[PDB]
Amino acid sequence: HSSLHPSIPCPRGHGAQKAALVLLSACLVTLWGLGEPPEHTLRYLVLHLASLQLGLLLNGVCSLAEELRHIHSRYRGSYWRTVRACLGCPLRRGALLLLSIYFYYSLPPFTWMLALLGLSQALNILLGLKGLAPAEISAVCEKGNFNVAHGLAWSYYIGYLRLILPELQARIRTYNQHYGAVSQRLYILLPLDCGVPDNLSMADPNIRFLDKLPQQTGDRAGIKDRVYSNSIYELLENGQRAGTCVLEYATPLQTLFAMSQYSQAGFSREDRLEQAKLFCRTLEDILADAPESQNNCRLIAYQEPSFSLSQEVLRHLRQ
Amino acid sequence: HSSLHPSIPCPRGHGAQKAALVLLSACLVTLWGLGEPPEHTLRYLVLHLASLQLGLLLNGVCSLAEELRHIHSRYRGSYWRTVRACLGCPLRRGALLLLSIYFYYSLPPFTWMLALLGLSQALNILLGLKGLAPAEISAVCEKGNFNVAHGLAWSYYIGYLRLILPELQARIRTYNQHYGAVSQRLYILLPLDCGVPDNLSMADPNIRFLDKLPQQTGDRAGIKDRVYSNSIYELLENGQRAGTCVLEYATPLQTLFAMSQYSQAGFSREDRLEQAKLFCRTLEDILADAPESQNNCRLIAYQEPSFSLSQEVLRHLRQ
Amino acid sequence: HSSLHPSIPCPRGHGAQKAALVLLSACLVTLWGLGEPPEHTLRYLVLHLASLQLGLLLNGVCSLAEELRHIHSRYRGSYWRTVRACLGCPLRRGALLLLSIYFYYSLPPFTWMLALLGLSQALNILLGLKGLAPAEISAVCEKGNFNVAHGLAWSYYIGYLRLILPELQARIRTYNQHYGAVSQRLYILLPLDCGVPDNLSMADPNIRFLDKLPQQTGDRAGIKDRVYSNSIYELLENGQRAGTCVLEYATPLQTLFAMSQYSQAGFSREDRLEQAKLFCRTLEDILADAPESQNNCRLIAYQEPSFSLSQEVLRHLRQ
Amino acid sequence: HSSLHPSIPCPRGHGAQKAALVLLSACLVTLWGLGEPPEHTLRYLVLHLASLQLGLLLNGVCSLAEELRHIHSRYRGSYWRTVRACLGCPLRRGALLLLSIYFYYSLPPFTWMLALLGLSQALNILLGLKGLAPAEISAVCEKGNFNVAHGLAWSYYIGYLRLILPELQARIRTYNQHYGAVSQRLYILLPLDCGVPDNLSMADPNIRFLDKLPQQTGDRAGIKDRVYSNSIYELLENGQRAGTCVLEYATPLQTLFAMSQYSQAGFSREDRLEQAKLFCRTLEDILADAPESQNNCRLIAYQEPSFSLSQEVLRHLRQ
Ligand SMILES: Nc1nc(=O)c2ncn([C@@H]3O[C@@H]4COP(=O)(O)O[C@H]5[C@@H](O)[C@H](n6cnc7c(N)ncnc76)O[C@@H]5COP(=O)(O)O[C@@H]3[C@@H]4O)c2[nH]1
Ligand SMILES: Nc1nc(=O)c2ncn([C@@H]3O[C@@H]4COP(=O)(O)O[C@H]5[C@@H](O)[C@H](n6cnc7c(N)ncnc76)O[C@@H]5COP(=O)(O)O[C@@H]3[C@@H]4O)c2[nH]1
Ligand SMILES: COc1cc(C(=O)O)ccc1NCc1ccc(C2(C(C)(C)C)OCC(C)(C)CO2)cc1
Ligand SMILES: COc1cc(C(=O)O)ccc1NCc1ccc(C2(C(C)(C)C)OCC(C)(C)CO2)cc1
């Protein structure tokens, strides 16, 4: 579980297998209750599996007819690789295909069934009735790491955090020696609504500015002397400076909000919220596992519902 | 067909429908040739479609028994939302289920078949069978914009290009008047190999640095005075200068490479190449559709072979 | 039972044999209670063992059809070597096969059963099934010293300890006479978490540096004058010095951690913890059996919890 | 394939599946020829698979009786985790087992067969006849990355090479500016026989010494100012200095050799050769993929059979 916000979803578990197992148990109980010859049950089961295998093969060939079109580009110009990418491991599929043909043409017409199955598959493809409901798509995307969040979070870590966090204590110490009473941790805010305002004081008058840390330099992607700066914002409580930190927004949230605004992104508000949660979780995990985040960064996430950003930041601070 | 670099893959086409159509035509011809009553054909076809609908329903029931765990977080507590997410369209799926059961019991036991289908689906779930082939999952993710690259490219546009392209002409003009004359285009390199060395001179000593453009500042996500810079690189040729332009590496390529290197990311080298290529395509498209791209920047794409970066960039400069 | 740290696992025992024995006893009792002619029992038992031998033979034939590709490289071209590597002991396995077939045909078709066994073994191989469970593979690898740690620990002994422990007393004596008196033992830290920060003071400011021991040189793997050094660390306590000793981090832990981080290694965090623990055990064993360990060095092991490294190392120093 | 040495084995392929497939085809053809009721063929095949599942459970419980002894240490004190690691995914295995019981007790005595299988498994465990032939063990260890080589190579990279390679060119340039005509690549030697001599000139009088590079420093594992030096050997051809390089031996080879010499390692000479090849291959792969090894080292491997190390090094050099 993530302590950042109760609203963060935990990774998908194995409850699906539990449900499948209980369903299978009840199902066998019902088969036993009916009392039909279990051999006939088994035969019909294996026949159904064979039919499903044939259907999968036909869907595969349908996709293959077009995956060939990209052979030179997407599949590095190798027909065998295209077949692998389309029908799965060719050896396993071929073996199952052969076994299915044997157990159909053998057990108690094969050509007629093949025709009917092909017709059904073609109908499924043409009508597009075949497809995955949102739950399956989301599960595959999370398990396969296909979510834009994943990418944005890994960028926010590798590109920026991995270079600033190690030097953060040094920069803070130098600034304090040269001059207030700042803490020694970058406080990054994650507005789950992706309502990032450019002017930080715009969010709350209590959030004001004190000074800017010395610009940190470094070569990056050929733009040498690229500089990553920071802003030491001061927490104005009861009209008083309760505390000064290095408060920050996670830039990728702005990116998500914008691509939600635009059209070509093909990205919707519910997706904005979903990817925001996923980004928060992934970044949390990365920082927790990585060493460079040794009490140098604190992640704050707040659900806009009234609301007092300054008080929440102060709460996380005094803790 | 893409134009950036020949290996870039064009978007998937509607060919699969054509393949299914030709398959349907051949299947109908052979079914007619077989010579059996069409009433039996329709009967078996509708029964088989009912079987698929029941299987999908049971798969949805299992996925729901899973997702109800996260209902509170991923679905705001609205049960109907989870049901929609799992079963598909509740109204359409329910209507199809009702029609299926009606026709089966009407058309020439029943609970036995339902049990057998449930058992088959349970085996499929338990033994980890319902896994889409790489091609199909690729198509789905691309269609739904579920790509690691997509987010990175959209950030790059919204977060660097959209903010540097406009003032780029002003910065170039100021440098030219202050001072050998750089070109009026920002040249971005898109190494498919994703090497992205830190300093240009390392990759090709024929490329040399000259000066920096005027630093551009601005307020961005809490930090104000966030200053974006550049680095004019002198393009030598056989020991002589033959052009000057603002050269660049697409940092998201650095992100992709580092992601590939690391392990927690769960990312693969094949995925690295594929995602980088998709990034190039998406950046090209968005830039072409971006009004700020008034020929202010040129995207350079190349793959490792022998190969001289300086010669290729000069060749592109000749235009 | 290990003594370094309570969580360290002792080597696997023969408990599996005891479980097999009790199971055999119970099975024989129940078989006797069932009350059938022992001749049938022996017939079916030997038939089943023959079936297993045939299955193992066929699996070996397939593995041979694979390994003959590498015969030239991994086996020096000696066909008999490959046959031994695949089928097991050629003489013993051949004799068991001959006895099996003789009894099989003798005892109350044949080729049909052989083909069925071949079908079973085929499916097992193709579908991807004959995979050992994690516990069994762990036992096998530990028994055969197929462990990532094993090599690292053996290097650490042969390559640092065996070459520093002897002259360590001389170096300590020289430093003491030159100049607060360090102890006569090398204290090696074994962080199971594998954090291994570069500088001790980072982990615990209570630990401070005092001076370095005399550098030891030597000829090693081409590089002569290869010099191994140390770093005496002052052990403070509540702002006061209470001991000095040559603190040390077991470097191979750095290798394990970085391996876990990287992806090309194909290494997992669970494997990281397991291998680090095995490394501690193996280092303890080798060191105890090493004559050079005349109480010249103490192995310190600890796990993250709150926890103070300085306090624990001092507690060990009290001995 | 590895260009280092023809003797290096390539990674194990998929030929095993090819052999399994052809075996399956032959078995099906034989079944068709004998022409037994294919229904009976199935019945017996599925029953055999059920028997295999029962046997696997028995072996698993036998292993569990041992593993439970280590629950607190090697399995983080969770019975469920122990069962998972001993019997595989409990859900899947349990479901297959339940289906097996239903199909046995249903299809054409269950208790008698269970007793017979239990006796067979107990006999297999007690007699130790159950086991993996060398080919399977090697394949699993290599696929699972359990080979000592793997660890030693990853150490040799992360600990040492990753720190010396980036600064190598700088050190060479500084040395040349201060003073011969060395190249810019650290040449590593991999004696496949693990015959590493401490005195490099001992291998060949032609291999003599010129000077030592400036000692490179750096903090490592608390031993700050740890120094990694180098030796600039000079190639003496025809009594003349043909070339000067940074030739060096791969230290882990010494570790492998010595750990072969000792007894507690439980390691044999053929294993020395095997792990030497594996180490060379893994190191080659890692350096090829990593960026830091950008034409900064050249791996040399030579099979001692007469032999002229100097000529081989010169050949690799002038190339
Ligand atoms: N708080 C904060 N202070 C900084 O100085 C800073 N600099 C970058 N970032 C953010 O962290 C990440 C690191 O940039 P990345 O390399 O992955 O891609 C960056 C990078 O390729 C490019 N870019 C941004 N700033 C610069 C810059 N100064 N110079 C060159 N390129 C830049 O535009 C991409 C997207 O930037 P943002 O997505 O809007 O926020 C960045 C980014 O999320 C910063 N965040
Ligand atoms: N060519 C060369 N020049 C060097 O300076 C050097 N220093 C280490 N190595 C080798 O690279 C690898 C890095 O050592 P690692 O840190 O992983 O464990 C090292 C490390 O824990 C310890 N050790 C060796 N040298 C030192 C040293 N100077 N200071 C502290 N510890 C050392 O002993 C372990 C094994 O050493 P070797 O297994 O014989 O060769 C090492 C090793 O193969 C070197 N190789
Ligand atoms: C991971 O294992 C699997 C992978 C895949 C896949 O690649 O989609 C499919 C199936 C896999 N195992 C399940 C399975 C069950 C039954 C059969 C079988 C018998 C072997 C008993 C007769 O009956 C049905 C059949 C017509 C298919 C032929 O074989 C085979 C397999
Ligand atoms: C990857 O899937 C597998 C995993 C494992 C494992 O984890 O050991 C074993 C086997 C797996 N697939 C192969 C398989 C074959 C046959 C059966 C089946 C039928 C489903 C048709 C009847 O036959 C009889 C049965 C009692 C064997 C179970 O049901 C199921 C599966």
From Swiss-Prot, chains A, B, C, D:
The keyword Cell membrane applies. Changing S155A: Slight decrease in c-di-GMP-binding. Renders the enzyme sensitive to 5,6-dimethylxanthenone 4-acetic acid (DMXAA) drug, leading to activation of the STING1 pathway. Pfam families: STING_LBD (PF15009), STING_TM (PF23417). Changing E248A: Strong decrease in c-di-GMP and cGAMP-binding. Activated upon binding to the hydrolysis-resistant 2'3'-cG(s)A(s)MP, an analog of cGAMP, in which phosphodiester linkages are replaced by phosphothioate linkages. In contrast to mouse protein, not activated by anticancer molecule 5,6-dimethylxanthenone 4-acetic acid (DMXAA). 2',3'-cUAMP binds at Y160, R226, T251. Changing K130R: Does not affect amount of ubiquitination. The modification Phosphoserine is found at S229. The modification Phosphothreonine is found at T217. It is linked to STING-associated vasculopathy, infantile-onset: An autoinflammatory disease characterized by early-onset systemic inflammation and cutaneous vasculopathy, resulting in severe skin lesions. Violaceous, scaling lesions of fingers, toes, nose, cheeks and ears progress to acral necrosis in most of the patients. Some patients have severe interstitial lung disease. Changing F146A: Partially constitutively active mutant that promotes the production of type I interferon in absence of cGAMP ligand. Homodimer; forms a homodimer in absence of cyclic nucleotide (c-di-GMP or cGAMP); 'Lys-63'-linked ubiquitination at Lys-143 is required for homodimerization. Homotetramer; in presence of cyclic nucleotide (c-di-GMP or cGAMP), forms tetramers and higher-order oligomers through side-by-side packing. Interacts (when phosphorylated) with IRF3; following activation and phosphorylation on the pLxIS motif by TBK1, recruits IRF3. Interacts with RIGI, MAVS and SSR2. Interacts with RNF5 and TRIM56. Interacts with TBK1; when homodimer, leading to subsequent production of IFN-beta. InterPro entries: STING, STING_C_chordates, STING_C_sf, STING_LBD, STING_TM. Facilitator of innate immune signaling that acts as a sensor of cytosolic DNA from bacteria and viruses and promotes the production of type I interferon (IFN-alpha and IFN-beta). Innate immune response is triggered in response to non-CpG double-stranded DNA from viruses and bacteria delivered to the cytoplasm. Acts by binding cyclic dinucleotides: recognizes and binds cyclic di-GMP (c-di-GMP), a second messenger produced by bacteria, cyclic UMP-AMP (2',3'-cUAMP), and cyclic GMP-AMP (cGAMP), a messenger produced by CGAS in response to DNA virus in the cytosol. (Microbial infection) Antiviral activity is antagonized by oncoproteins, such as papillomavirus (HPV) protein E7 and adenovirus early E1A protein. Such oncoproteins prevent the ability to sense cytosolic DNA. Residues 1-15, 68-89, 128-319 are cytoplasmic. In absence of cGAMP, the transmembrane and cytoplasmic regions interact to form an integrated, domain-swapped dimeric assembly. In absence of cyclic nucleotide (c-di-GMP or cGAMP), the protein is autoinhibited by an intramolecular interaction between the cyclic dinucleotide-binding domain (CBD) and the C-terminal tail (CTT). Following cGAMP-binding, the cyclic dinucleotide-binding domain (CBD) is closed, leading to a 180 degrees rotation of the CBD domain relative to the transmembrane domain. This is Stimulator of interferon genes protein. It is found in: Endoplasmic reticulum membrane; Cytoplasm, Perinuclear region; Endoplasmic reticulum-Golgi intermediate compartment membrane; Golgi apparatus membrane. One of its GO terms (cellular component) is plasma membrane. 3',3'-c-di-GMP binds at S155, Y160, R226, V227, Y228, S229, T251. The cGAS-STING signaling pathway drives sterile inflammation leading to type I interferon immunopathology in severe COVID-19 disease caused by SARS-CoV-2 virus infection. Tissue damages in the lung and skin lesions are caused by activation of the cGAS-STING signaling leading to aberrant inflammation. Endothelial cell damage is also caused by activation of the cGAS-STING pathway: SARS-CoV-2 infection triggers mitochondrial DNA release into the cytosol. Residues 146-319 are annotated as: Cyclic dinucleotide-binding domain (CBD). Changing Q254I: Renders the enzyme sensitive to 5,6-dimethylxanthenone 4-acetic acid (DMXAA) drug, leading to activation of the STING1 pathway. Changing R226A: Abolished cGAMP-binding. Abolished ability to induce autophagy. The chain crosses the membrane at residues 16-32, 43-67, 90-104, 110-127.
